[PDB]
Every structure is written in C-alpha cells, then in structure tokens.
Amino acid sequence: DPTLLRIKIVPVQPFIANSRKQLDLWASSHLLSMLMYKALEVIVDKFGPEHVIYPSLRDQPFFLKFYLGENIGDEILVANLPNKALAIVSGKEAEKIEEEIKKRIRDFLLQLYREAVDWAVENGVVKVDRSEKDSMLKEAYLKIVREYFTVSITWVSLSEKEDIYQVTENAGLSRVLERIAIYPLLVKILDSLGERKVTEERFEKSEQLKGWKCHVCGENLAIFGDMYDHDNLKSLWLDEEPLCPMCLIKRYYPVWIRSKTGQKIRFESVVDVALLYKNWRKIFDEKYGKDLVSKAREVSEDFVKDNMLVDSDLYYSSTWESEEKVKEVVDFLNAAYKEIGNPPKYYAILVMDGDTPQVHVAISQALANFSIREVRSVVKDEGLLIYAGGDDVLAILPVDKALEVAYKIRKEFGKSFKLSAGILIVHYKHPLYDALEKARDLLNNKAKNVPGKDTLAIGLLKRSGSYYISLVGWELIRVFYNSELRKKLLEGKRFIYHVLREVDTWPKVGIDEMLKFEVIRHIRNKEETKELREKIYGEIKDLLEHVRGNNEVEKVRGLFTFLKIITDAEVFP
Amino acid sequence: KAVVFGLYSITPVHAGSGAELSVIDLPIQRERHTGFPVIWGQSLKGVLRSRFRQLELDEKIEVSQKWKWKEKTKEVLKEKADEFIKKVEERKRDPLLTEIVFGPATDGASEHAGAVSVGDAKILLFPVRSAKGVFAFVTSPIVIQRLKEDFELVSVELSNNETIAGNALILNGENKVILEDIVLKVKSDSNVIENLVEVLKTLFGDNFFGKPIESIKERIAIVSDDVFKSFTRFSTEIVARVRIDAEKGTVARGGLWYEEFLPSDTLMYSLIAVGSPKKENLPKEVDNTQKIVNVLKVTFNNAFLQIGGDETVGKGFVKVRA
Amino acid sequence: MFDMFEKAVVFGLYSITPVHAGSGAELSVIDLPIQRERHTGFPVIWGQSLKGVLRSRF
Amino acid sequence: IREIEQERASFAFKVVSDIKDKYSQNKKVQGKYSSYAEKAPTIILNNGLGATLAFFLSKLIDDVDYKSINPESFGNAENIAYAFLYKHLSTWLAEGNGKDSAFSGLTNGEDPLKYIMEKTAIDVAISTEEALSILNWIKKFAKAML
Amino acid sequence: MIEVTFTPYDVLLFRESRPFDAGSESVARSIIPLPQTVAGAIRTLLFYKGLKNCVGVGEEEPEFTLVGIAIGTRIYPLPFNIIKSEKFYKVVNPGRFLGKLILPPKGKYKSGYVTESILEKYLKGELKEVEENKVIRIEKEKRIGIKLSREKKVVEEGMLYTVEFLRIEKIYAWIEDPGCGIKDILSSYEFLTLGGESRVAFVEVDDKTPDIFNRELGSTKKALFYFSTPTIGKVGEIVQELEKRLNAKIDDYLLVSSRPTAISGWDMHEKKPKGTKFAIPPGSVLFVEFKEEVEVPPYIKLGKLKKLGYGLALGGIWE
Ligand SMILES: [Mg+2]
Numbered sequence A: 001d002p003t004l005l006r007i008k009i010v011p012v013q014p015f016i017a018n019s020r021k022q023l024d025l026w027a028s029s030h031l032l033s034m035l036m037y038k039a040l041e042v043i044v045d046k047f048g049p050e051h052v053i054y055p056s057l058r059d060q061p062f063f064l065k066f067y068l069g070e071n072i073g074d075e076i077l078v079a080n081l082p083n084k085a086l087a088i089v090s091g092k093e094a095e096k097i098e099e100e101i102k103k104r105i106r107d108f109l110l111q112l113y114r115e116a117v118d119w120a121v122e123n124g125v126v127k128v129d130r131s132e133k134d135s136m137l138k139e140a141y142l143k144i145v146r147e148y149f150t151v152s153i154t155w156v157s158l159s160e161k162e163d164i165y166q167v168t169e170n171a172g173l174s175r176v177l178e179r180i181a182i183y184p185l186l187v188k189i190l191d192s193l194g195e196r197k198v199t200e201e202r203f204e205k206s207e208q209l210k211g212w213k214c215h216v217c218g219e220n221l222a223i224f225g226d227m228y229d230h231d232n233l234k235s236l237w238l239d240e241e242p243l244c245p246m247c248l249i250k251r252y253y254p255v256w257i258r259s260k261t262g263q264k265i266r267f268e269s270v271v272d273v274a275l276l277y278k279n280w281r282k283i284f285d286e287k288y289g290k291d292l293v294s295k296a297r298e299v300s301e302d303f304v305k306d307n308m309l310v311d312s313d314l315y316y317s318s319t320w321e322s323e324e325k326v327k328e329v330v331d332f333l334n335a336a337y338k339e340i341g342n343p344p345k346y347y348a349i350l351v352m353d354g355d356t357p358q359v360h361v362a363i364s365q366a367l368a369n370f371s372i373r374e375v376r377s378v379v380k381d382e383g384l385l386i387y388a389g390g391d392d393v394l395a396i397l398p399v400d401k402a403l404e405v406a407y408k409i410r411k412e413f414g415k416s417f418k419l420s421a422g423i424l425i426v427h428y429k430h431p432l433y434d435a436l437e438k439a440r441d442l443l444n445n446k447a448k449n450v451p452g453k454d455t456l457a458i459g460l461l462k463r464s465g466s467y468y469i470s471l472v473g474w475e476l477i478r479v480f481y482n483s484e485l486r487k488k489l490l491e492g493k494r495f496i497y498h499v500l501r502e503v504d505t506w507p508k509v510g511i512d513e514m515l516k517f518e519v520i521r522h523i524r525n526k527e528e529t530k531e532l533r534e535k536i537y538g539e540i541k542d543l544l545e546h547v548r549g550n551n552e553v554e555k556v557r558g559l560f561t562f563l564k565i566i567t568d569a570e571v572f573p
Numbered sequence B: 001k002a003v004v005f006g007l008y009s010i011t012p013v014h015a016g017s018g019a020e021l022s023v024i025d026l027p028i029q030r031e032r033h034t035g036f037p038v039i040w041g042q043s044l045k046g047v048l049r050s051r052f053r054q055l056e057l058d059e060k061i062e063v064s065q066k067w068k069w070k071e072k073t074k075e076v077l078k079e080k081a082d083e084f085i086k087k088v089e090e091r092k093r094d095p096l097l098t099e100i101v102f103g104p105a106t107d108g109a110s111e112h113a114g115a116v117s118v119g120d121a122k123i124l125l126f127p128v129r130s131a132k133g134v135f136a137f138v139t140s141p142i143v144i145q146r147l148k149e150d151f152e153l154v155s156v157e158l159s160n161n162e163t164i165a166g167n168a169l170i171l172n173g174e175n176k177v178i179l180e181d182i183v184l185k186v187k188s189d190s191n192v193i194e195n196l197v198e199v200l201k202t203l204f205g206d207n208f209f210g211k212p213i214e215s216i217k218e219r220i221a222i223v224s225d226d227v228f229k230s231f232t233r234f235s236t237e238i239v240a241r242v243r244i245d246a247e248k249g250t251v252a253r254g255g256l257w258y259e260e261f262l263p264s265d266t267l268m269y270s271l272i273a274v275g276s277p278k279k280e281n282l283p284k285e286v287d288n289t290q291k292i293v294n295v296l297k298v299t300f301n302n303a304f305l306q307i308g309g310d311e312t313v314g315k316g317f318v319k320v321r322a
Numbered sequence C: 001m002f003d004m005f006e007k008a009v010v011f012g013l014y015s016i017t018p019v020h021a022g023s024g025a026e027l028s029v030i031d032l033p034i035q036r037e038r039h040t041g042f043p044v045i046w047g048q049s050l051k052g053v054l055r056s057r058f
Numbered sequence D: 001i002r003e004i005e006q007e008r009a010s011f012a013f014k015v016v017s018d019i020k021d022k023y024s025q026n027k028k029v030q031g032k033y034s035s036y037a038e039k040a041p042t043i044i045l046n047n048g049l050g051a052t053l054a055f056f057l058s059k060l061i062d063d064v065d066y067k068s069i070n071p072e073s074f075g076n077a078e079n080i081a082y083a084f085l086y087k088h089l090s091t092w093l094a095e096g097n098g099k100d101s102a103f104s105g106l107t108n109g110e111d112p113l114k115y116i117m118e119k120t121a122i123d124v125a126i127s128t129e130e131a132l133s134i135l136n137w138i139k140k141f142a143k144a145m146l
Numbered sequence E: 001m002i003e004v005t006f007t008p009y010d011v012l013l014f015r016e017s018r019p020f021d022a023g024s025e026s027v028a029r030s031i032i033p034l035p036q037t038v039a040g041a042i043r044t045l046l047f048y049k050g051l052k053n054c055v056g057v058g059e060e061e062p063e064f065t066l067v068g069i070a071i072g073t074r075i076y077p078l079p080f081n082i083i084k085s086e087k088f089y090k091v092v093n094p095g096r097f098l099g100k101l102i103l104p105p106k107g108k109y110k111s112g113y114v115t116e117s118i119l120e121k122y123l124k125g126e127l128k129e130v131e132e133n134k135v136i137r138i139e140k141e142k143r144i145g146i147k148l149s150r151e152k153k154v155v156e157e158g159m160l161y162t163v164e165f166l167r168i169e170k171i172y173a174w175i176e177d178p179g180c181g182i183k184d185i186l187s188s189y190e191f192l193t194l195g196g197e198s199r200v201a202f203v204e205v206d207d208k209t210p211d212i213f214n215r216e217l218g219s220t221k222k223a224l225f226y227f228s229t230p231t232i233g234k235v236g237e238i239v240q241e242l243e244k245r246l247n248a249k250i251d252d253y254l255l256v257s258s259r260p261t262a263i264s265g266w267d268m269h270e271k272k273p274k275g276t277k278f279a280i281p282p283g284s285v286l287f288v289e290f291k292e293e294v295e296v297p298p299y300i301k302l303g304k305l306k307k308l309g310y311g312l313a314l315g316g317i318w319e
C-alpha cells in the first residue's frame, strides 16, 4: 500500500541565527542536517534509499559515512541535508514511522545534552563542582532539549482513487483515478497537510522557570540561571557567557563531530575567514608568524595553542590594547602593517535561495549534484561553506571572493537547470545573530522583492554604523570585473560622491549626457584620455543595464552605491 | 511635571550620528521618519548630566541654599555613606543629587532609576539665507503641528512655491521672499506667525535668548513641508577638514574628510519629562517631582552648554531657556 | 552660567595681506572660494583652521 | 534649492540639444557656442550681468527685446552662436522653463537688461547668481554634447 | 470600556530578550510591543499613585483587565494567510483534503501591517487582495551611543552601545476596570515611561469602545479568529476554551501561524527576568468549522494571562 510520506523539521533559521561565534553557526546548520539524517535512517532501514524521493541519499556524505560506513573526507563538514524530505512507504507502517522518527530525534538530542553536560564540567565551560552535574540534568533543562525541535510527519495514500477535479478544487487549486496519477499536485497538497500539522505540534512547549537567560539565544533559561544572579552566573561560565541547554549542545557539537569523524572546519572564526583577504595571514605568518607567537606566549601561555594564537583576533593590534610585553607586540604588529598592509577586518556572509515520482527523483539527483559537489567545488578552501541543501546556500567568505563565489554558484545552478542572493559585508566585531538576520533580510526582502527576482542584494554594514545596499543583476558582476572602470578605480571617492550627491538634480531626459560629463570631469596623453572616456562611459552604460531600479536615476544611484561599497578602503585594504 | 528646554545654537553644532545614511563622512543626527536634524535624548542627557555633576562637585548647585552633597549623602545613606563617597571620588559613582536626577552611574544602575526622561531636541526654527534681512528663521506646518501637539499633551496650508513670512524678509511691493537662490511668493496671512511667536513666548518668556521676541516675528518664514525638509537636508554646513603632515607641509595620507554641521541660529526644543525621584531615603528638599523640576530650571535656565563634538574647534555651543 | 570654562581670551586678527581660508574647489566661476557662514554669507575662518595654525606655531 | 537645479538642468539640456540639432553638420557653430558659454560667466564676474548682456547686444537694434532675436538669420558662426547664447540666457531669466513649470523666470517676461535698469539691487543680485548657475549647467551639457 | 491612547514623545524601545549591560553585550533591538509591557507601565503608575490594591504586586496579573493593545499611525499585522504575489498581497482561503482544513500552496508569507479598515474587510471575508503600497512596515531608528570619562572627555573602555528603536505614532490600549478608578488616575498623568531607555509617551484616556469590538458578523459555521495580540497556551486548550465560551462543538480547525512569540520580560518586584513563555504570534488566524451555526463575536479573549492583554482574538467569517 504505497504511501507518500513527508518529513519537515523546525525551526531552522531561528536556531541557526542563535549564534555568537562562527562555530555556533556551523554547528547549528550541521546538527539540523544530522536530525534529518536520523529521521531518514528510519525510512531507509525498512525501504532502502531508493524509496526516498527527496533528497537523493546515494550521494549524501552523511549517508555515505554514517550509513554505508565509507571513509568520507572533510566534505562531511558541510551540511547538505535540507529540513524537508519526501519518501514512499507502506501504509501500514506510516503511523509507526512517525512515532519512531520523533523518538530517534528526542533520544539523540537528550544523549547529546548528557554528553555536553559532562564535557562542559570536565573542560571548564562551567566552573562548577562535578557534584552539580545532576542539577544540570534536572527535568526543567531536559524539557527544553526534548521540546525544542518540532518534527512534522504527514502522509497520503497513493493507491486511493478519487475524482481528480473534486480533490483539486476542494484543496484550493476516467475522471476517477489513483492519487499517484496527479502526483505533482499531490506533492503540493501534502505540503499543506504538513504545514497544518506543524502548528498542531509546535505550540505545545512547557513554560520555563524564572531566571537569567542564555546569552547566545536570549530566549531560553540559562543553566543555573534560576539559582544565581547575573554577575555570579556570568562568572560561572567561560567567557562570562551563560548558556541554555540548546546552546550548550551547540558548543559541544564541534568536539562531538571531531570524535565521530576526526574532522573539524578549517576556518574556526569569522576572523579566520576575514584574514583570507589577499592572502594577508599567509603573507604575515611567513614573514612575522614565528616572532609574533613567541611574543604572544611571553605575555601569556594561554594566548598560544599548538604553536598558534588561541584566537585569530590577536593579529589585530587593538585586541592587545583592549604591560611591557604587550607594548612589544603592538609595536611589532604596527611595523608589519606598514610593510604588508593593515589586516582585513571585514568578512562577507553569503545566503542564496532558489526563486511521476521517477522524474522527481531525477530532479533531486540534479539538486544533490549541484549542492554536494558543484557549490563545494566553487567555494573550495576560499572560505567556509556551511550549508548547501539543494537550491539554498550559506557561506562565510573573505570580501575579495564574495562576489566571485556568488556569481559562480549562480552560473553553476544555471548549467544544472534562477537563484537570488544576499551578500552582507560586516565587521568581525558585529554580533553574528544580527549579521545573519540582516543577510537573510537582504535575500528575502530586497533581492526576492525585485520583479522577476534573480537578484543579488549586496549590503555593507560599516563598524561606524552606516548601511549601504545595492541591488544588481548577476551579469553586473561579470561586466564589472572585466571592465576598465574597475582597474581604474583600484589603480575614486570623489567621482562616486559627486554622482551620488547630485544624481537627483539630473534631468530625467538627459541622464546619459550627465554621465558623459562626469566621466569627462573625472577620467583623463590626450590620446589615452579620449579612449578611456569612451570605454568607461560604455562600461557604465553596460553596468546600468544590470542594476535593479525603477528608473534611470535609481539605476545610477544603485550602480554608484555598488562602486562605493567595493572601493571602501576600510573594507578593502 | 515637565520642563521644556529651548536650545538656541550660537556656534555650529555637530551631534554625530554613525548610523545616518549620507554621502558625507561625518553626518549629524537626524530623525528617521522626517529627516529633520535632531539632538538625541541620550546626547542631551549626557550633556545635562555632565554639567550638573560638575556643579554639584564644585558646590555650585542651589536647592535657595547651597547644596552640600557629601553632607546630604551622610544624612541619607548613613552607614553606607563613606563607601559611596569613596566610589564617587573613584569615579565609580556620581554625587548624590546627580544620581537622583539622572540615575546611578552604570556601576549602580540596578539600585534605582533616574527621575528625568530627557526627550529628543526637535527642530523648530532653521536659519536660511535671505536676500532681505540677512537670514530667515524658517519653519513648516508639520513642525508647528508637532510643537503644538507636544505642548498641548504635556500641559496651515502652503504650496511648495508659497511662504508665510514677516515683513523684514519681503521685497518691497514685489510680495516675494528669496531664500538662498530660490524665490517664494508671499501668501497673505494674519495670525499664523503671530500665533507661533505667542507659543514661543509662553514657553521661553519675553526675551528670546537675549533679544525681544517681537524682533524675531519680522524674520520668520513659514514654508511648505517639502521645502523645509529640502533646506534642512541640503543647507546644513558641509565642511572639508584636513590633517597636515608638518614634515612635508602637505596634506597627510588619509588626511581628508567631510563633516556636517547644524548652523548657528537654530532653535530646538526638548521636553524633559520628570518623574518622582526613585532613590530610597531622599533628603526632604528633593523628595518629589516638583522639587526636581525646580532645581532643573534654576540650574539650566539662561545657561550655556556645549552639545555634540568638536568642542575645541569651537562647535556645539547653545543658549538654554528652561 | 558657562561653568565648563573658567576664562576666555579674544583673539583679534588683522590681515596685512589678502587671506584665502579655503573650503575647496567648486564647479563655479569662482573655482576656489573662501570660507563663509552659509546662512549669512559672511566670511569666516573655521575654528579648526585657526586651531591648526595656533597649534603648529605653539 | 534642489528642484531649482533640476529645472536648470532641464533647460540647459534642451537649449544645447537645439544647438546640436540645427547645426549638426556645422561644428564651427557648435564650437563657438561652447566657447562663449565658457567665457560668459567670466565676463559676468569681471564686468557684471548688465555689461555682459550689453556686450551680447553688440554682437547682434531698435529696442532691447530678446524675443525678437533670430539667431539663424545671421551670416557667420560667431554671431549665430552669440545670438543663441544671448537668447538662451535671457529666456531663462525671463521665462524659465515656461509658466507650466516650477521655475518660470525671475523677471516675469521682461527683458533682463531692461529689468536690471528698473528694479532693485537685490533683484539684480539674484538675477546675476541665477545667470551664473544656468551658464554653469549649459557648460556641462556643451562639453558632453558639442 | 476605557480607551487609552499613548503618544510617544520620540522613539520607543521594546527590547528583545538578550543581554544589554554596559561594558558587555551592547546591542538592543526592539520588537513589536508586547501587551504585558503596556500593562506593566500602567501598573507601575498605580504602584506610585498609592493604589497598590489594583496593581497585583508580585503577581502575574493585576486586578484590572487589559483587553489588548494595537499600534497606530491604527494598524494590524498582515494575517498570515495573506501571501505576497508580485505587487499584490493575496488572501488565501482554506481548502480541504482528506477531510482536513488546509491552506493551499500559493507562496511565502511576507511581513507587514495593514490599516484597521483593511482588516475589517478581511474579517468580513470581503477582502481579495491588498496593493503593496497599502502594506506598511514599522520604521526603525538606529542610534549609536557611548559613555565618556568624567574629566578627560574621551570614551571609557568598552563603553559603546547600539539601540534599534521603533518610530511609532500611536499605541492604543483598552482596559476593563472593576472599580479601581484607573480612568481618573490616568487622567491626572500627562505622560509615563513606556519600554526601555526611559522613553515616555503622552497619555490620553477616553471612555469608549472601539467600533471593531462592536461589529455584527452574523451567524455561521465557518468562523475565523484573528489574533491581534500574542495568545498563550496549547492550541488544543485554546480550541476547547473556544468551544465552551461559544457553547458549540467544532468539526475541524486550522491554525495558520508562524514563528512562536518568545515572551519573558522583567520582574520589577523581584528585580530579575520573568520565566520564558511561548505564544501564538499576532496575525495568526484560527479557521474554525463549528458543528452548528454560531454568532461570531466581534472579539473574544482566549488563553492565559488575559489580564495582561494577551489572547485578544477578533471575530471574522470565511467561505
Ligand atoms: Mg538603558
């Protein structure tokens, strides 16, 4: 009795957004993929991987490593399993599968928490006696773990016959056929069924105790938050950062994956990713790396681990400033800066999203190949690829690779089959939860709100507070990189200022002529001068074609806003 | 109760906003919804607190006697007075009356709240160059409506080409006013300017910061909302500043930036909402709202303050009427 | 009621040569105008210009 | 002060386009108009608006009336370009972009030269600034189109 | 019923639950005001006026009942069954499959606010769509501040912070007073502190019932309930409560909603955070097919902490 079964796990983005360090962000996405894997194990055990329509499991690194027992490399570190799955099961097992999937996920999370509790006390995450471990495992804390994720499971019989026109009209969309006959419509209706069951389950959480909250998510009671005041609670935790049970799991999760796979993400914090800019860290380490680590340990042994700085922010002089051994480091750092340039302090957050069961299987296989192999190949070791679950991507990138990676991924998606994207350039000090929410706002409320979508939304949030946003078509990235304008700008602010400040005074009927003027005024032998002006004007006109805007004025504003972002000397040192 | 603080700039003012979107390197604080220049309540409160604190420490605060804060601290905190006074000298806490009025320094924040709520300084009159009468005190219907609403609760129709202006701005017989390089035709009106002046007189008194308010009436220009907004955004001072490498005698690397200034002769107003003093065991002369209000008026009425940055290059000075 | 300062000195300045306190180039018939208070049109020398001069000499 | 800039830019684009249209094959005329547009603010700066308008007058009378000027009826490029610039500048000060627009002039249809002779010093100053501003916009489009 | 109108002097902060202490975590982002915050402001005024009988000091709820709140420019969050499609936000009515009420797939939900008049047409089932220009977003104002040293006038170490305020024109609150004399006490005050950073709002008070609470919708089996304020409790208990209060059993129901509203707050009595509660977010719609025809009430209070302004549902019909 063939039955189409749908699995959905929530929440996703709220859980992922509850992050302070880059490791939290990776662990969040990775754990979510792990939860779907634990769920799909139940399906595969009975019906094999070929009964899972979406996603394609045969290519999934989690499936290859944890189910088939293959020796998978560092590609296990990427979250590739999405939060929705579709499978075909026997009808008599449907209800039992639902119960068992829910149970696997509860148990797995509870087990992770018990280990996290043990790990936390033994490694000084919580400065408490080992006798207080029982307090951490009390029911109030276990409730939070047990109830956090909602796993909705709905199904519909494929064998049942129904009047097609009646079932589709009533749903809000021989005349009597089996439901599998209208499979495409059935998949969508099953999504509706699932959404109904989501709200039947996710509003059943238990009220929590009075007390101070986790500093990472801010919403759940921190462990020991009901038994101490704020100042004392903070002193009990590493980095004065109290954690709820879910964020404790999040902090423990990297070492769990480490023990399970031997693997760990190469770039640990956003600073590690930031310092990839123009190979700055690599150049520095070759030239000054040995000396710095020596002086660093001279200040404190806790600053050095495995012949490296315990935190990559120690490449910034300001980190050392905020006694005589410290002054020796800052003078050394400042000397290096004058030689090889100031260290990059900005990084980029990239989020992307897309705008017969046998045919559906083929689609899933194409999405699997794109997400697992293609996106990974593009990103490679140029940054950190955290999530690629089909038509959606989350990566952390150095600012000099952000546009290129995003464009490449977009083109790769085109070869396989439109994607919109948000890129947020942000200071390494900015709170990660806010950066991620801004990045998704760029994607969801800017790029996807443009008619026809398929848009890149680039945001630059300066440390001082300003927030510049430019909406561009994907072809703008190609045109710009090959343009003489780019080489001239990076060979400036005055040209860009004049245009942005005065574009609203330009006549609607004569925008092009005013562009000609500003090029004449800012671009200059007379032989080369005439050629450069003609070329750059043509490039500007080409670029304007791919800027998102109501009118020519907004297109000009959008373009020179883009130019202002990429010429920002503070962001691109 | 509440106190209305009138602020009249006598030098250009730079209340810095990092979050403001602008083509200028260092723009001034502005309201999100209107785009009007503003001084944040928190900026103003910091200014007021710093002045009040200095006066208290220097025994210059009057409550009609000399306020002796260490004496009052001992007759209030009793056994805990000495350690508190020690914290004040250690700059961990502020003197007694300062903390009563503005709240404890951050170290003692949770003990109690500040009695006052310092509101944004909202723009009221913005100076614009006039062909006649040197310059005009410019405002708009939306501004007047905001002022009236703020005052009424605490207790006009113009096209883009029209202005309701005082006589000293109007070209003889031409019925025109010229603000900077644009021409506005004078709309006949009888009481709107007069009504506005009356409101100003009811809040700040007969003398307008050192001049009769009747003199101001002749140089007030009411323009449309769009025109006023345009002037407040594009007529503020935009000044280039540099740093000179004295070794070479030329402008240093990265030594050029642009800064925005609110002009002198700008009138702004902030409503200071005063609640009951919240500290425990208050001295009698400051144990309620009216007494806090009275000290605020005497301390800041006719005072000179510096608001915003660039103090040492002569910016941010305002006259105060409370 | 100006308690942030304790004393003040007036610096009188008499030009014996023409003076160009600049504000920068403009797209105008006067390419390099002198500093002016915008809402009065009066010539000024900004405090930061004068401070830089006084500082360098001192 | 922003809308007035847009109005000026609209006028400037229009008059320069008319120059380029009527004298497309005549680069001498286009080049002369451009040069005179560049020199015009200088003449105003050093001699005043009145004298400059008078100087243009001598390049062309019975009465001072910019409306009556016919630039295309002249023999050489010098006089053609002068007559056009003169009429353009005068039209702007007197009519703006028409009475159906935000800016309809300063002199209410009166020839600016006679206007200067009759009105106040204030009226002359604003007309001088406005003249400099429109020429500044004409110079922009001249360099980019001519 | 008394209608309280709060007019913010400038900006308002209704901070999310996250650490915000000087010298540490230094970012404050505002959320849409929770009704308990408005209730707290009123209770604090009575606490200082000496009417500690009606306050409920140390208690979850006061003696009086806050019916609910609404922000104004009066506007309401877009019902979650309204989905943006191109330049229009389209109303999506319930469908049926396997004998269950469902919402057919028609796109993702996009947040926003609509006027009271648009909501009224929606509740009457007469709304098909809304042009994207009539969908309002709440304006935010970001301010970055510092703390200066007492004498040197330079920034103290680590003393920089950021606040994302809301720019709101009006907040409306409706209160049922069992004789505590709230209307008289509120009339004596011109302003009060509302939310964080010691921001104040002017207070006006009028004895009136808003027209939206007085609508006549008629009798039907197919009723819907738009939650204008967060609603606390299990969906099953809320539906059961609804069955009791309207004296009618339900054949089926569908809750169209979103991310649960995380609610904690600050206990001014005990000087520590309140316990975290979870609620059905404003804008959520409960579609109900009763077994018999019911007279759909203009409004009805559901769930826990009713007196704090929670669980205010507005009645409506669907087909
Ligand atoms: Mg605060």
Ligand SMILES: [Zn+2]
Pocket (backbone or CB within 6 Å): A018, A214, A215, A216, A217, A218, A219, A220, A243, A244, A245, A246, A247, A248
């Ligand atoms: Zn947490």
